[PDB]
Design a binder for this molecule. Sequence first.
Ligand SMILES: [Mg+2]
Ligand SMILES: [Mg+2]
Length: 89
Amino acid sequence: MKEKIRKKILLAPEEPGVYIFKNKGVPIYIGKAKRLSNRLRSYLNPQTEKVFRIGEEADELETIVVMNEREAFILEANLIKKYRPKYNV
Ligand SMILES: [Mg+2]
Ligand SMILES: [Mg+2]
């Protein structure tokens, strides 16, 4: 994983949000979190091959802090629909 992404993960707030791993400007995985910190840190110790791939392929990680879990739910759904990222089913 790129060092800048590891850094961003470790700095991420304990706040609801949506996260977007990207490669060459293209989202490759979009997810949501009740706490960005907790969810993003899970990528550092990959529990699945897919998690491993997402973290290795990415050259950028964008985070969007949201008002609450309700906003996380709909923002995530909308962005997945818009971008249909590689690693989202
Ligand atoms: Mg999701
Ligand atoms: Mg709420």
